[PDB]
């Protein structure tokens, strides 16, 4: 079967061409060792060993490796002899775009089962290594043996890690030499199922994962990925990680676009961004452009054009942060569920954690690591300690967070608007003092912050009479272009876009600010009770960028006047209200 399979992998040719040999020969010389071979080929070219692989991929994908590296030899070494010794072997990257099985499978029948699995990952990409061909010299018998662990690609990340202690004059005659024995640093990653998925089964689901050579940081949030399902086990803990059924895996990790491998609709949105929500056109436009994203430009200048830097949306419960967070999450890739001082199992600046997967301090991926793509939502925001105010302020000032602690010094990249809200102090003291004041008041914390807001839900006059019925309430009692479709338009504007602003509405905004300043330089003769006429110069560019995003809503390479003028009116209402 070895020769038939060796030939059949030579014949593996998807509906494109014999790309897996020429591209192979032209890819080994620098980086691409083993080309990612999408596995729509095996389903038609050899159905017998296709069933064998869907049944027992443990001791078969090593034959895949052997045949693919052997044909890689037969081609690249021939081109070497035509152009200019060992040609170190490869670990192929095999998976398919069909027959999807997320972590819905957890049972024990899945020893040696490959399934085209998609799923999210949170953290614990820890690094370790295992040997490929094991070199063990005996001391009490002088017996040198180069016995492999019996595979290099499907190793635990069925291989038991004993070494058959021979004649026992000494406690360990057979001793490992790790120089002559070749090994691979394989990172011990973790696997979770996608929480944004209609098919759900076995609510407790979790497996391990391996990143062999370049499998690290190839999966990005929100993508329909194709990784290996599960592998046999050196049995885990039993009464590690979770106790029951924690195997080491042999994942190969193909990643591409959701739908591919190598191989006027807005007039219904005038209110549809809010199927049931009420008003607050300013905060709601903030929310729709938050779902949009704003501007992002790299072209030559002395900075990068930022978008939606900051909002202080602090407001009372009743606003139903439930529905806000749930709809944004359903539309966003992964809504960064930040809890005050903590990002994920650590603080805002990620804290290192001594994981027993490596039994060492690994940098626990922070919310920030998972925040590129989705808007940070800070709940429990009021009880946040003042000790890391400047920490978040620094992040707000740039984007990324520079986490530099014991052993780990990295500026981990984060790129999204903010969300700040909690139950305001003194009840509705926010009404008397500034729109801020959900947390401490000191004017220094407020410095880097940009925009403050108040939310209007359908309970305002319940403070005069309805409160009575309110306690009696205790006694006696989508319609829009889909969430995934908005995420799709957003990924297709991250791909390519140039919907810039328009000069005429730009000068209109410049007017409706400068002429305000001129009417008020004239009204200084009236000696206005406004404390100190401020420079509305960062809020102004904020409005400019929000009109830019409202133009991104309409693809116009020079902004249409409709969205820009609407945003202009609403943000002058907001700024004017703030001034009041």
């Amino acid at each position: 079967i070895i020769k038939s399979f060796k030939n059949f992998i030579l014949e593996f040719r998807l509906d494109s061409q014999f790309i897996y040999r020429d591209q192979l020969r032209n890819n080994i010389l620098v980086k691409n060792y083993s080309l990612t071979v999408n596995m729509e080929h095996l389903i038609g070219y050899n159905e017998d060993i296709y069933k064998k692989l869907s049944d027992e991929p443990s001791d078969i994908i090593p034959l895949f490796e052997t045949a693919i590296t052997q044909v890689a030899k037969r081609i690249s070494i021939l081109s070497r002899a035509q152009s200019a010794n060992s040609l170190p072997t490869f670990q192929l990257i095999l998976n398919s775009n069909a027959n999807q099985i997320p972590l819905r499978d957890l049972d024990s029948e899945h020893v040696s089962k490959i399934v085209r699995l998609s799923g999210i990952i949170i953290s614990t990409s820890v690094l370790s290594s295992r040997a490929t061909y094991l070199s063990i010299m005996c001391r009490n018998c002088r017996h040198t043996t180069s016995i492999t662990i019996n595979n290099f690609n499907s190793i635990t990340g069925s291989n038991i890690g004993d070494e058959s202690t021979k004649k026992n004059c000494g406690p360990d005659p057979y001793i490992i030499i790790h120089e002559s024995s070749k090994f691979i640093d394989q990172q011990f990653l973790k696997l979770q199922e996608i929480p944004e998925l209609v098919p759900v089964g076995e609510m407790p689901r979790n497996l391990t994962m391996t990143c062999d050579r370049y499998l690290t940081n190839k999966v990005i949030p929100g993508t329909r990925v194709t990784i290996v399902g599960i592998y046999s086990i050196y049995n885990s803990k039993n009464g590690s990680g979770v106790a029951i059924r924690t195997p080491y895996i042999k994942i190969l990790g193909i990643q591409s676009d959701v739908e591919t491998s190598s191989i006027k609709l807005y007039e219904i949105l005038t209110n549809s961004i809010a199927p049931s929500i009420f008003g607050n056109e300013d905060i709601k436009k903030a929310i729709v452009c938050l779902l949009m994203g704003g501007s992002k430009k790299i072209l030559p200048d002395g900075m990068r054009l930022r978008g939606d830097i900051n909002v202080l949306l602090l407001g009372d419960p009743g606003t139903a942060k439930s529905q806000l967070l749930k709809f944004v999450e359903k539309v966003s890739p992964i809504a960064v569920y930040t809890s005050g001082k903590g990002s994920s199992a650590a603080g805002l600046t990620a804290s290192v954690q001594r994981d027993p997967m490596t039994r060492e301090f690994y940098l626990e991926g922070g919310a920030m690591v998972l925040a590129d793509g989705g808007v940070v939502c800070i709940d429990e925001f009021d009880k946040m300690r003042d000790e890391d105010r400047v920490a978040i302020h620094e992040a707000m000032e740039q984007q990324t967070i520079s986490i530099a602690k014991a052993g780990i010094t990295t500026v981990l990249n984060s790129r999204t608007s903010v969300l700040a809200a909690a139950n305001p102090i003194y009840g509705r003291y926010d009404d008397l003092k500034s729109p801020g004041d959900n947390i401490d008041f000191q004017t220094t914390i407020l410095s880097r912050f940009d925009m403050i807001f108040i939310v209007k839900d359908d309970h305002n006059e319940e403070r005069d009479i309805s409160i009575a019925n309110h306690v009696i309430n205790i006694h006696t009692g989508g319609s829009e272009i889909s969430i995934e479709k908005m995420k799709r338009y957003i990924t297709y504007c991250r791909l390519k876009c140039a919907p810039r602003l328009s000069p005429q509405a730009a000068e209109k905004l410049s007017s409706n600010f400068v002429t305000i300043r001129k009417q008020l330089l004239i009204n200084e003769l009236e000696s206005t009770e406004r404390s100190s006429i401020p420079i509305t110069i960062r809020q102004l560019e904020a409005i400019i960028r929000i009109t830019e995003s409202l133009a991104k809503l309409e693809l116009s390479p020079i902004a249409q006047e409709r969205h820009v003028d609407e945003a202009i009116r609403l943000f002058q209402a907001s700024t004017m209200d703030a001034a009041s």
Binding site: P88, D301, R538
Partner: protein, 585 residues
């Protein structure tokens, strides 16, 4: 023996014999060693000429160094102990000077390259003590001599596996009589597996053997090339099952870029680049367009742009004989609208220019901006915490939010600047750490934006020296009329929709090509100019401190460096004094 080692021996013999110049250089330093009645004899070699001669040797070196290098060791030992028979010395190779280009970030040196030549660039922090570990041991049999030699063949040797079996100490071996040891005669190879850390501007233990002992100071992103191998004991036979130790060898040490700033810039030039830079510099007008090169979002205050480009030039900081190296670099303070002035003017030096560690004052001090003696539970030992700025070498550190300094910080600015380096005498230790970096500071007006309106007396609450101790002091405008805000709007819109960055290759070029040391006519100008300064504007604030004149040199002398002019023009001095009038008025 097997024929493969003999073939490799012959190939390396032919390779070294091809370049008899290096043979004679080794012979010369070796006859010097003999006349001195030595040096670890690994030769600085480049794997480039190998492609001209060695087609199988070079083929097997990079793929598997443990196979083709130990022959390149044995054959060299033979050829050299034949080159020198006089005295009675590893005769190895150091591989320094080749184009490895592997493992850009030491976080992933293990994945791609296994059992291969691996380069890694990373800071060398917490260097361990020297370990002059014995390998060659010599001994004496209590009777009749029998002076026994021993080579401690182990796994912890340089590259090859040497049967890691405990031969720590033989005694009474091969003879019934006693074996005494003999020290000194037996060599003690410098096993110093120093902890070199990573490089964040983009903690493996590298064993620096007998010549690379402490080649770099703490804060050096050393481009060390070694052989990524693995060895050791983990406990897969006893009860402890864990993995094993992976470790990179030590072959080459290309340290931090010495003459220019650190390794990251790499702003060498090509004939097209030299021609573009020359076509630029010879033109009198370019000095002004640099303002547009430093005015991407804000406009006006082009004099501040001039200041930025000057302090980017570097200055003429000169090393005076038998005395302190005078400060020729400049550090400029900025103060204005904390909202807009800081962000805009900063975002060049922060993101674009170079080597500008963002420093908020209290916060970005981190553990400490200056230093701190830290006795750690990890090794149970005390090292130093050199702040980023003092960890920096030659850069231009940006300190935003200056008014948020902790009290103890307020003194570092005096030593890091006026004494050019930070000397600390703290608990149990005293050391003069190098902090020679230009500084761009941006201080918030401690009360809103009245830094412009309120007089500088206690304005930032630091009028006494902290105001003047920074060389130049700049203030933007706050109260503007229709026209300035309108131009602001015009530009912010035309940007929300003249080479700025290339100038970097222009800057360093000057500071290594041409230097306007000084000119007597510019002296005759500036000295009388400064006498007028200290005679006329005295009533304002008396910032007339002679230190200012020092800057009046620095500034102008960097100007002509930006100008590339070999001389400090008198009108260069005019530009200097007018820049100062701008900073003063």
């Amino acid at each position: 023996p097997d024929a493969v080692f003999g073939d490799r021996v012959r190939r390396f013999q032919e390779f070294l014999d091809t370049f008899t110049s290096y043979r004679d250089s080794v012979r010369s330093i070796q006859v010097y060693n003999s006349n001195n009645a030595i040096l670890p004899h690994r030769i600085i070699i480049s794997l480039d000429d190998l492609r001209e001669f060695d087609r199988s040797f070079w083929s097997g070196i990079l793929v598997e160094p443990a196979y083709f290098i130990p022959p390149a060791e044995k054959a060299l030992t033979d050829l050299a102990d034949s080159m020198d028979d006089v005295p009675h010395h590893p005769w190895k190779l150091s591989f320094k000077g080749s184009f490895g280009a592997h493992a850009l970030s030491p976080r992933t040196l293990t994945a791609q390259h296994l059992n291969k030549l691996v380069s890694v660039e990373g800071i060398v922090t917490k260097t361990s003590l020297v370990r002059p570990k014995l390998i060659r041991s010599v001994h004496y049999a209590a009777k009749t001599g029998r002076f026994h030699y021993r080579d401690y063949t182990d796994a912890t040797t340089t590259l090859t596996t040497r049967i890691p079996t405990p031969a720590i100490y033989p005694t009474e071996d091969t003879e019934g009589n006693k074996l005494t040891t003999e020290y000194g005669y037996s060599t003690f190879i410098d096993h110093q597996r120093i902890t070199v850390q990573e490089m964040p501007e983009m903690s493996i233990d590298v064993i620096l053997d007998d010549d690379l002992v402490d080649k770099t100071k703490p804060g050096d992103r050393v481009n060390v090339v070694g052989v990524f191998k693995s060895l050791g004991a983990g406990g897969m036979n006893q009860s402890n099952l864990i993995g094993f130790k992976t470790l990179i060898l030590g072959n080459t040490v290309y340290p931090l870029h010495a003459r220019s700033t650190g390794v990251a810039a790499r702003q060498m030039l090509t004939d097209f680049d030299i021609r573009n830079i020359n076509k630029l510099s010879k033109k009198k007008d370019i000095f002004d367009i640099l303002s547009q090169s430093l005015a991407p979002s804000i406009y006006g205050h082009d004099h501040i742009k001039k200041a930025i480009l000057l302090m980017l030039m570097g200055g003429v900081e000169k090393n005076l004989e038998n005395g302190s190296h005078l400060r020729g670099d400049i550090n400029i303070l900025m103060v204005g609208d904390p909202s807009t002035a800081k962000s805009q003017l900063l975002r060049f030096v922060l993101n674009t220019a170079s080597l500008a560690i963002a420093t908020t004052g209290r916060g970005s001090s981190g553990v400490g901006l200056t230093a701190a003696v830290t006795t750690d539970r990890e090794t149970g030992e005390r090292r130093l915490e050199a702040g980023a700025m003092v960890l920096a070498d030659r850069g231009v550190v940006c300190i935003d939010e200056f008014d948020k300094m902790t009290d103890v910080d307020r003194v570092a600015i005096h030593e890091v600047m006026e004494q050019q380096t930070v000397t600390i005498a703290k608990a149990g230790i005293h050391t003069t750490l190098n902090a020679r970096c230009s500084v761009i500071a941006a201080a918030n007006p401690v009360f809103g934006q009245y830094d412009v309106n309120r007089d500088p007396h206690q304005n930032i609450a630091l009028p006494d020296s902290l105001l003047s101790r920074f060389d130049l002091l700049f203030v933007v405008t706050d109260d503007i009329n229709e026209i300035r805000d309108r131009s602001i709007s015009e530009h912010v819109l035309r940007t929300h929709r003249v080479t700025i960055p290339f100038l970097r290759k222009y800057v360093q070029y000057a500071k290594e090509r041409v230097i306007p040391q000084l000119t007597q006519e510019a002296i005759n100008v500036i000295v009388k100019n400064y006498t007028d300064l200290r005679n006329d504007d005295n009533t304002k604030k008396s910032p007339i401190t002679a230190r200012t004149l020092e800057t009046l040199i620095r500034l102008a002398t960097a100007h002509a460096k930006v100008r590339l002019s070999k001389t400090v023009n008198k009108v260069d001095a005019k530009v200097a004094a007018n820049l100062l009038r701008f900073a003063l008025l």
